[PDB]
Design an enzyme around this catalytic site. Sequence first.
Site, PDB file in Angstrom:
ATOM      1  N   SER A   1       0.840  -1.220   0.000  1.00  0.00           N
ATOM      2  CA  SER A   1       0.000   0.000   0.000  1.00  0.00           C
ATOM      3  C   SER A   1       0.850   1.234   0.000  1.00  0.00           C
ATOM      4  O   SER A   1       0.581   2.178  -0.738  1.00  0.00           O
ATOM      5  CB  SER A   1      -0.966   0.029   1.176  1.00  0.00           C
TER       6      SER A   1
ATOM      7  N   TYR B   1     -12.623  -4.760  -4.209  1.00  0.00           N
ATOM      8  CA  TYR B   1     -13.834  -4.110  -4.737  1.00  0.00           C
ATOM      9  C   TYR B   1     -15.005  -4.992  -4.307  1.00  0.00           C
ATOM     10  O   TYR B   1     -15.540  -4.816  -3.194  1.00  0.00           O
ATOM     11  CB  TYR B   1     -13.737  -3.857  -6.278  1.00  0.00           C
TER      12      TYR B   1
ATOM     13  N   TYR C   1      -2.113 -10.729   2.714  1.00  0.00           N
ATOM     14  CA  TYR C   1      -2.064  -9.353   3.139  1.00  0.00           C
ATOM     15  C   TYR C   1      -3.484  -9.016   3.575  1.00  0.00           C
ATOM     16  O   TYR C   1      -4.399  -9.010   2.763  1.00  0.00           O
ATOM     17  CB  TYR C   1      -1.635  -8.498   1.966  1.00  0.00           C
TER      18      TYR C   1
ATOM     19  N   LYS D   1       0.774 -10.505   6.434  1.00  0.00           N
ATOM     20  CA  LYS D   1       0.875  -9.171   6.988  1.00  0.00           C
ATOM     21  C   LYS D   1      -0.499  -8.842   7.458  1.00  0.00           C
ATOM     22  O   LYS D   1      -1.425  -8.689   6.606  1.00  0.00           O
ATOM     23  CB  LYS D   1       1.330  -8.229   5.845  1.00  0.00           C
TER      24      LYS D   1
END
EC number: 4.1.2.51
Lengths: 298, 298, 298, 298
Positions: free
Chosen positions: A45, A108, A134, A163
């Site tokens: 990110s 989404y 993630y 993560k």
Amino acid sequence: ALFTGIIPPVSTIFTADGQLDKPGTAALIDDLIKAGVDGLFFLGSGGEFSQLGAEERKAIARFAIDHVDRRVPVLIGTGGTNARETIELSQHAQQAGADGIVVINPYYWKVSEANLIRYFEQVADSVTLPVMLYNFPALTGQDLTPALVKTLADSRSNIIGIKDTIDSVAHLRSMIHTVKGAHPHFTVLCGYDDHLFNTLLLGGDGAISASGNFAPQVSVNLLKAWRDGDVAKAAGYHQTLLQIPQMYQLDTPFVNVIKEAIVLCGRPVSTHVLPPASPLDEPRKAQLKTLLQQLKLC
Amino acid sequence: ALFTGIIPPVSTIFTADGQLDKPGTAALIDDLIKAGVDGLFFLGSGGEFSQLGAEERKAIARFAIDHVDRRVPVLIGTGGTNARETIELSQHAQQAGADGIVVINPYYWKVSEANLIRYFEQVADSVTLPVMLYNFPALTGQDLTPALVKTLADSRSNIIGIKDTIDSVAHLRSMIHTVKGAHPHFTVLCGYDDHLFNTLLLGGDGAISASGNFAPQVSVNLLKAWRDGDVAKAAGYHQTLLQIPQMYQLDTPFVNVIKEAIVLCGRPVSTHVLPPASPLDEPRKAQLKTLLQQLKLC
Amino acid sequence: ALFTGIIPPVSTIFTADGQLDKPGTAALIDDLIKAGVDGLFFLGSGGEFSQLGAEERKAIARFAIDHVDRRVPVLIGTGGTNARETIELSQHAQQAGADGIVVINPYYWKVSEANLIRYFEQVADSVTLPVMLYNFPALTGQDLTPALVKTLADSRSNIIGIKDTIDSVAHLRSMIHTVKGAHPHFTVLCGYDDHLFNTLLLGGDGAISASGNFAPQVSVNLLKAWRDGDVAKAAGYHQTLLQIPQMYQLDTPFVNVIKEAIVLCGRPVSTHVLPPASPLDEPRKAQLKTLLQQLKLC
Amino acid sequence: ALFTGIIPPVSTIFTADGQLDKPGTAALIDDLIKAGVDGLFFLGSGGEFSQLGAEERKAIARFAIDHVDRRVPVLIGTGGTNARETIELSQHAQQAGADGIVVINPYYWKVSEANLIRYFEQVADSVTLPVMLYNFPALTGQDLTPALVKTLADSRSNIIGIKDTIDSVAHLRSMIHTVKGAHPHFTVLCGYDDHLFNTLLLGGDGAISASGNFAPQVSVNLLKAWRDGDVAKAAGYHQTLLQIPQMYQLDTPFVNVIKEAIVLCGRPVSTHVLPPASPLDEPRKAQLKTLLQQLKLC
């Protein structure tokens, strides 16, 4: 256990026209390696993966892997909503020499559990590389629960860590007990600076967090202290880490803030960020500076 | 008022290897035009924009616009998380002959209000086409509030409507009062089948909703009955539209269900959908069929 | 089916010192009966149950049942967080002559499903009266899902309906298919004014909604038109009901708004509300009036 | 700074018929005082306030204040949804000899900000006692944000602290910066066991947490070690506190769990809890036991 320790989500440095800034990205990579990080994560990110096209991401990954030149393990974030593109980016990461990929869930549509398991199984099957999951439910709107992550690690032996980016002791504790309880070498990394210390004490493995960009020494030294059994020293570092995330309120996205901090902490890179993020204004830059000064980081 | 009435979010028909099925998509487009729809919307959520690459989206838009051949107004969904790609997709739409673009808010990072206003302004400024906003907070995790939409329509004269996809009478009513109260010709369309009737009675302008693909006549006849002052007839169509969304529970995403219903309702197209969506299984296809039979739709 | 049709959640009228205003509450009850409502619901959310002590609630219910004097069916809301007090209030309701009780889920702790089922089963077993469930997830933070309500109706034959207060066509539709599909005479009543029409069209049974207090004739005439097969007329009342809930935005809680509307619509009752609600200010009372005037309600 | 340090939310011990168990509640109080706690908090969420009637709560509070007999500061939880009853319970607390009250926001209706401030101002005005605010947004559905809490501390000089029950480093951090930054002696206490250590390192003041009932020595000794400058010893206690909250997953509400743990940890009290909570089953009691054994707590 693969990919443990301190692994920054490296900022992608861009020039003023939004092109990959190779000298600045190279210098940042070299800074972080010299700081003693255990690995480098590109196109997370913080690396602005979601503001980049597929071909741009391949170019960035290849550049980064090549520049690192095997000095530390390299992870490439290959996720998104376009699952066919995730495979392509993941196979490309493997071909270009990455040591692992990090894959968020599609953010989404919040796909049914059956489609979600299938998705990660398919990605995992597309490469021989280690896969780190993630979780970032504040952004995705769909949590990767400990039970599901355990199901994914039971299903594919190359799904080897996560993560977990969430401000929640409970989620980290439960990720650790559930997944590490069934898979002792499954890797659990927190995605927030102020969870590193608890993640270690809980029996997890380290952090992928923004401050790895501009104050890696705090995390590196915390991990080292902890591994030396100097818990008090580690707690001292934690106390800085507890305060750092104040700065992330300065903007949303705060990829600009992170790059501004890299500059203030002594590495002059272009701070350009991609739309829909935007340059941090001067008042907030000075605010960031005062925070960094109070924490003795610049 | 631009883009009012019944404007299906047209399904993109793909072959088995995931390529644009030109004969099938053409046939669907012709079906809907001959059903009397007021416009066609390509590459909405139902058109799988988020599972497609940018070049793929360009090819589909170009094909679609070209096949419609100006018979009805054409909208192209150009949104995403990559704002530079949104500009490129929007400018491409305009060059390819589209009548308008439909732009969702970035759905990874929930960008600050300042960034969000700036994003939409930038996109609006990149084209001379009308721009429809797209609100889908269940997916995006960030609501386009009526106040925010008013502020966008106040700022830019080419931001002239919104597809408001939300199971909420309050939201639709407030969008209408706040935005149409300041801008009488701003267009409000609901994104759900079962909100079309209320949207009309509330002073809004129609619907962009999934059943436009497989039962456009229900919405078309509802709108006609309404405009004719035959409220009782309108309500009878409404009663069918109230029941249709049962079927969307059969999978998530449910783009598969929509395409299976296209086939069941008389139009034999390939039902392939892009990962991470997957084929509807035979038990659920049989369920779907029973529903459609109960509703007198096939 | 029990307790169908239009059943207002009656406002409790208080004197300035916060005691039950018997003449005002009596006059309101008589107005509603005279308007043709199908029952009356005391101590719902609009009756201020959660701002009243148990002894006050017993006094109110006793008064109300007595004044109605069996002219229409009477429900008493007996819910809260203190389950022992729910049993006490519900036994008291039964002793006092109520025709049924309305019981919300505990809204402090969101109790586990097993605790929730057991709670409702125990409440239901404490009385021989019919029991209506009350779902208000916006306030409770815990939805009574259609599957769970089905499970409660399968468990106890005196759990015979629900007030489903939620701005969601899907929730209503699914509550009707799931519960009424297994229990054809189980009663489904929406709790919002603007969902009555859709609830009737979906196969449900009517509404318990705030506007029954100041404009019962709208709902009453809607239901009558519907039952007479005059769908156009029903839709015309629906159009008014679509617009009414604008006024509830004037304050939170909006019990004050509802009592100010009773006055403006021609019944001069005291508008005192209990803390932490407070008096509506004059500018908002004037906005309310303008609203009621635009809707032809006063 | 008032009410700093370790202040358990004391369980209320009930007999098998659900009456106040005075010998058991007295013995538990005496254990906690002997363990070195800095105060005692009765009728918090763990004390089951929300399952008790007002006269019950008065009788409990009076018993408790009397039995403490001024050995440590005593807080009484007087909150609820019934604002008039909050004033009554708070004045009753003051008359009975409490040292302060702890007041949660109303948790049925989520009252407007203007009503909320007014509510807390009115309760604060009703007593001369120090008031502690109580934030528990997972249950209340309405967060007391640092900004609001600062506005309340600016407004009333007897609003002097907060119990902030939320699994969130950011919230605690921001509470501290915002409120203590304006009011250095405003007290910040976390409501979760595993946030005590962070709360201290962030500049807050202690904890009101469930484990203060069955393992007060862990928190007491962590606070003492921290105050002594023995950070490593404090971190060792923290490590136990990080793990304890696993046991709270055993049931919801988990008031049963806490009381079972008091038993297992060496103090034989009745473990009865009020509906809608229910007795912990044997399998889960054994699980609690194994957890407590792993943590060396029994």
